[PDB]
Amino acid sequence: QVNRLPFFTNHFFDTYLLISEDTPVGSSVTQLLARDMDNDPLVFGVSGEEASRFFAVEPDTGVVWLRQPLDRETKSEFTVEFSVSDHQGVITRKVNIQVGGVNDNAPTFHNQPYSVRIPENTPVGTPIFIVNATDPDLGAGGSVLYSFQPPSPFFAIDSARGIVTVIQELDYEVTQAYQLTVNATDQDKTRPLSTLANLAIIITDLEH
Ligand SMILES: [Ca+2]
Ligand SMILES: [Ca+2]
Ligand SMILES: [Ca+2]
Ligand SMILES: [Cl-]
Ligand SMILES: [Cl-]
Ligand code: NA
């Protein structure tokens, strides 16, 4: 007769819950399970402004949906309060949700547009420009690899550091401006992503 309050029976409450950041919105991520000694019909929910922004809960079935895209690069851990109610009380428990990473970012260049003026007598070996692309993904998918695409016979860019170096004698009267495109890619062994950036190398000859 005196009501007994519901309690959760999911094990994840003791451990945690992992959701991949590429889980599309609408996907069910789990289903809350609760027990009630009175066998009252229960209603489920999620509490908290944040938790409620990213997660929705089916009140009768306790199925937990993904309401907003998860983005590990922005927030990688949630503590969410789930609620269960027999209509006489509301009981609450927090679970930790780790958002798993995916290579979902192309490298992104900084300090564009890229242009450099250099004299034609610039010696082979001279570093003339630093290119910089960042990639916020974890592991190989956030580790960037520079290259010229297509390759240049006059210039080389260091794969690790993005330092563009002159590798062959320049000749103003042949070429007075090169239009190279650099390719930054991450190194996800299976599904890499990549971005292109133009580099203007313009040659000068003051001693006509
Ligand atoms: Ca009850
Ligand atoms: Ca990436
Ligand atoms: Ca990612
Ligand atoms: Cl509980
Ligand atoms: Cl990631
Ligand atoms: Na992301």
Curated annotation (Swiss-Prot):
<feature type="domain" description="Cadherin 1">
    <location>
        <begin position="11"/>
        <end position="109"/>
    </location>
</feature>
<protein>
    <recommendedName>
        <fullName>Cadherin-23</fullName>
    </recommendedName>
</protein>
<comment type="subunit">
    <text>Interacts with USH1C and USH1G. antiparallel heterodimer with PCDH15. Isoform C1: Interacts with CAMSAP3; leading to inhibit CAMSAP3 ability to induce microtubule bundle formation.</text>
</comment>
<feature type="glycosylation site" description="N-linked (GlcNAc...) asparagine">
    <location>
        <position position="132"/>
    </location>
</feature>
<comment type="function">
    <text>Cadherins are calcium-dependent cell adhesion proteins. They preferentially interact with themselves in a homophilic manner in connecting cells. CDH23 is required for establishing and/or maintaining the proper organization of the stereocilia bundle of hair cells in the cochlea and the vestibule during late embryonic/early postnatal development. It is part of the functional network formed by USH1C, USH1G, CDH23 and MYO7A that mediates mechanotransduction in cochlear hair cells. Required for normal hearing.</text>
</comment>
<feature type="domain" description="Cadherin 2">
    <location>
        <begin position="110"/>
        <end position="205"/>
    </location>
</feature>
<feature type="glycosylation site" description="N-linked (GlcNAc...) asparagine">
    <location>
        <position position="183"/>
    </location>
</feature>
